[PDB]
Symmetry: D2
Subunit: 237 residues, 4 copies
């Protein structure tokens, strides 16, 4: 299977597979059963912001999700990603719907990665920023139901023309370029990601959520990963 | 054929195809016959620096090449790259040898591109920096004789183990990711590139040179583009 | 006498001192009498964006002023700013009202300066970005009527409690830190400034405008520089 | 009394005031008595690199000091710098000599500060980079014996014409511009500093070291702060 490190914005409580009873954010290391979760007052129809950060000095993967004029939710897990991920990865956005549904709209995505060497004492670096997405976005790999160009936004899951989200949808977008995420010969490896999202449900209960994820370069949507598996895992182990 | 916009560091005077009699730098728009050239005191065995810049306001493509403690050489050509390049390109380094030869060593390469929109008044951006190159550089597309990992440097053309450059060599390295270089809906499109290079000849006459180039995403070394064609052109037209 | 290089967004034609017959943008080298202007369809009460760029390679100062879903005004002048400016400068925003008036509201301002050279592989840089201003903004020097903190915005000129601008007002905001704007020992000196503004006038005649400027470090508002002199010049020579 | 947060590269063990028995690095919160230290194999006359990082999400100040081809020393402390620092600060480098001495040479210094929030999609930032210092560096406040321009290097403490460091010397360099280091209204506050240094001692006993520090804006060298107090503290409480 793929190797997956993910930060999940999980809108739907699957309490039979370790989810708490409320919308939550979570750090996923090779399982959909988050190693750490925190409560999250997702705001239906509002534009939200996720900030993810990692450095190799702290070995702490942290996420903060906020909306204008609200308390934030933050979650942190101590993990040494040199021991979990390959050296070269891809970075991506993933979302799903199941029996219940939501728009999984991305309005912007940025990402930075840096290696500062010990062997040569010099740095390697990648930064992208999308504030608009276009109909033909040749630096994104779109998988499953994911589309671009509707209002200059990335739609991770299937929406009708009037704007109605479909169930049993799964979708991802990956940056075209492999990223050098770690190097044993380095002093400080670090990355950050930021995206803004709009999750809108006609339902009183939306599902299933959005994740930022780091994977093997060849990662693809595992089979049957709609609903609670968020396009990231083949199963709930 | 490929579409090619190139800045050439041309070490060898092919006066039968429009070259001046001395080492020169040049701006190449779809031909090896530079639209503008300037004299260049290439320093055999010294680490040099090339800076290339473009913005959509000036529509001026400029290059500056310098060595520690020397006069610079600069060249500028007014060109509207929205009228020459496709919207999506790749960026790359190219070099060649022919009857005469030189190391075409790259020690570092950086690149930045930005679109600042008029439709949405928001910006898209890509930045990479290599200060080291590794043996398995998965964000570079290596073509022809190009290799990485020898001293953490990119060797564009074939060098023996003792360090002797071979003739009739051609080589390129392209950033894995397509770049959105222009957009009619934008207010300012701009890019810059920087690389450091070491060109060393045992000869009194080195050849053939190094180029930074922008091409169609699928660009490949045209056939017979060793020597004076620098890996960029199928012919000298 | 201060030394002033400025880009003027000039909302009011003073035809007696060289202004064209319409709202225009202009490059001002040591004089209110623009070396170069371009027609500008200023949009009353709409948020506009200004982009200024200079590089020492083309020795070309350019500006692009734009509004969402409109044509751009752009203006350009060939000038070598080391023949005009001292090595060390402050950067700022100025505005003024006269018999006629307008809000001179700045919602955001960013600035970048680099000196790259050939000592080895290292360069010198400064960058600030204000996307909101606060009531005590200690990295800004406010002069004349300029104030900050009202809706996180810089108000260059006097505005009453109930929203309406005052006549015979003049204000400026300077970045606290001096900027190394040129060095003789550098191969490429460059800078870039961006600001978003809201110019609102109660009636069809608004005055006098906004400028981005570069001055000597101890630059201050010259006497009698309200209205047409934009807070920048003592006289209209 | 100044408010001081500091990372100390401490070359001389003052065991009477809590120093460990060996050269160490240390996180100093309002006291010379480091809250946290780590062994550090200082290399006489070799160029080292210091990396400092803080983010408001982990509330974790970390430092990594390294030399080419050697193990790193790293040190980390959980501290909320809005409970310690005022909102507005200066950043600086300090060094000192006592009965014993060393060059306190800084070859380069860079610094980055960001406040991201949720007003909409905009954030506030500062960034400077010095890769060479000049004889009149107007964006630095030099204090005590600190000087610039000798081989493009910052000399924090007194060095004679013929290369040898002086005892009972103390000097500092502050960035001219105050820094907004925390805001209550922000979701992520972060900063990062990097400097390269050359510590050369004529004999086997060198003293006293270098610190990167953050202080109140009008911070100055306290009385009698040579040697073990590193230019930072009035006393060893
Ligand atoms: O709106 C203005 N100015 C614009 C507003 O400007 C402010 O606001 C602007 C916008 O905020 C800002 O840009 C500016 O910096 C400023 O603050 C303005 C208007 C009038 C002013 N002003 C002051 C005195 N006068 C006078 C006085 C006398 C005569 C006369 O006797 N005229 C008779 C006819 O003259 C003819 O017959 C005579 C006899 O045969 C001859 O002598 C003459 O040669 C001519 O043939 C005219 C004007 C005019 C001053 C400014
Ligand atoms: O190198 C130093 N310091 C290090 C250098 O430091 C500088 O340089 C460093 C490196 O640049 C820097 O870190 C520092 O901040 C500083 O600038 C240093 C060394 C000596 C100093 N100093 C000044 C006066 N004294 C005296 C005076 C008298 C006695 C005595 O009579 N000793 C007799 C034996 O004592 C015993 O018997 C007695 C009688 O029964 C009892 O009373 C006692 O209790 C004990 O049992 C000793 C010391 C010492 C001060 C500093
Ligand atoms: Ca769930
Ligand atoms: Ca040639
Ligand atoms: Ca005017
Ligand atoms: Ca000590
Ligand atoms: Mn979950
Ligand atoms: Mn040529
Ligand atoms: Mn004018
Ligand atoms: Mn200590």
């Amino acid at each position: 299977a793929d190797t997956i490190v993910a930060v999940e914005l999980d809108t739907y409580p699957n309490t039979d597979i370790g989810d708490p009873s409320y919308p939550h954010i979570g750090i996923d290391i090779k399982s959909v059963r988050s190693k750490k979760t925190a409560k999250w007052n997702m705001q239906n129809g509002k534009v939200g912001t996720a900030h993810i950060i990692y450095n190799s000095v702290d070995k702490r993967l942290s996420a903060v999700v906020s909306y204008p004029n609200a308390d934030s939710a933050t979650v942190s897990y101590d993990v040494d990603l040199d021991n979990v991920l390959p050296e070269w990865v891809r970075v991506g956005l993933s979302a799903s719907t199941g029996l219940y549904k939501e728009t999984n709209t991305i309005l912007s995505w940025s990402f930075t990665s840096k290696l500062k060497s010990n062997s040569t004492h010099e740095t390697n670096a990648l930064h992208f920023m999308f504030n608009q997405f276009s109909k033909d976005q040749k630096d994104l790999i779109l998988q499953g139901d994911a589309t671009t160009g509707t209002d200059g936004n990335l739609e991770l899951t299937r929406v009708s023309s009037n704007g109605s989200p479909q169930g049993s949808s799964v979708g991802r977008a990956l940056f075209y370029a492999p990223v050098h995420i770690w190097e044993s010969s380095a002093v400080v490896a670090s990355f950050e990601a930021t995206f803004t999202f709009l999750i809108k449900s006609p339902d009183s209960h939306p599902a299933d959520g959005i994740a930022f994820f780091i994977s093997n370069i060849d990662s693809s949507i595992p089979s049957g990963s709609t609903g609670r598996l968020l396009g990231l895992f083949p199963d709930a182990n």
